[PDB]
Design a binder for this molecule. Structure first.
Ligand SMILES: Nc1ccn([C@@H]2O[C@H](COP(=O)(O)OP(=O)(O)OP(=O)(O)O)[C@@H](O)[C@H]2O)c(=O)n1
Ligand SMILES: *[C@@H]1O[C@H](CO)[C@@H](O)[C@H](O)[C@H]1NC(C)=O
Length: 246
């Protein structure tokens, strides 16, 4: 398992957590020196548990699919909560089985559906360590509309930060003040699958992407990524979604 405590948290301890999260994801191969997530894992080994504690020391445990870093569900006290999707229903066969009851959330875990449930795009939702503290607190007691917003914060401050060093850094910058994600952050989130695929396709193509990936950069400028020499590949991305899952 991995853990993170908001009480006394700072950019360093958050960085240690994101490092722990990355290191808990199994891989047998690196592609251009980036860990390649496994095609599949059978049984309970498929799910990583993240123990997150809010400032007051209350806790949820979040179940993460180690093949794609997707959040499947979470446990809050004696109630488990899972997304309304087959991958999460499958996960519910393995994690949080001792929960006294199981609630299936009234949406799947994908950004589009969460944003609709939340009533706002995540362009407009501040993220940061304070926002994560709020998210944990919200998820402690069931409220599906509020939970959608909390889950958008949670996904971005855990999974997306694990996937991209830039996003980790953005959260570290928001250690004591929330701020809506940069357009570059949004872009990277949306492009993780595409980037993962193209980095893998570059292996037998002299490091060249078969199809360019369009990103928005730090300055808000839309740019094309065409090969593995780009800083996004060398610097930024920390985990690759296996093409067998794309
Ligand atoms: N059960 C799930 C489902 C999705 N995700 C998150 O959402 C992504 C997968 O679907 P996503 O692209 O978010 O959904 P879309 O609706 O396609 O998002 P958008 O339309 O905003 O691009 C993953 O990378 C992951 O970060 C998750 O954490 N847990
Ligand atoms: C590869 O990407 C680099 C850096 O972004 C760019 O300058 C260059 O034109 C690209 N080279 C090829 C061969 O595609």
């Amino acid at each position: 398992d991995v853990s993170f405590r908001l009480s006394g948290a700072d950019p360093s301890s958050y960085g240690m957590f994101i490092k722990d999260l990355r290191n808990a994801l199994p891989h047998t191969e690196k592609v251009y020196n980036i860990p390649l997530l496994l095609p599949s894992v059978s049984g309970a080994g498929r799910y990583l548990l993240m123990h997150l504690f809010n400032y007051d020391g209350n806790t949820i445990t979040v179940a993460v699919d180690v093949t794609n870093v997707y959040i499947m569900g979470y446990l809050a006290l004696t109630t488990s909560y899972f997304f309304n999707e087959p991958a999460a229903d499958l996960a519910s066969q393995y994690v949080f089985r001792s929960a006294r009851r199981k609630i299936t959330l009234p949406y799947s875990g994908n950004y589009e559906r969460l944003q609709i449930a939340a009533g706002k795009p995540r362009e407009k939702i501040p993220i940061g360590l304070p926002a994560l503290d709020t998210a944990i607190s919200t998820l402690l007691h069931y409220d599906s509309t509020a939970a959608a917003g909390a889950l958008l914060v949670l996904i971005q401050t855990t999974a997306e930060a694990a996937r991209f060093k830039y996003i980790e850094q953005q959260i570290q910058e928001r250690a004591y003040r929330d701020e809506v994600p940069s357009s570059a952050t949004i872009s990277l989130e949306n492009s993780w699958s595409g980037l993962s695929k193209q980095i893998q396709l570059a292996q037998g193509n002299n490091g060249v992407f078969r199809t360019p990936t369009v990103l928005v950069d730090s300055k808000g400028n839309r740019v094309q990524i065409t090969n593995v020499t780009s800083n996004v590949v060398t610097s930024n991305i920390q985990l690759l979604l296996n093409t067998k899952n794309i």
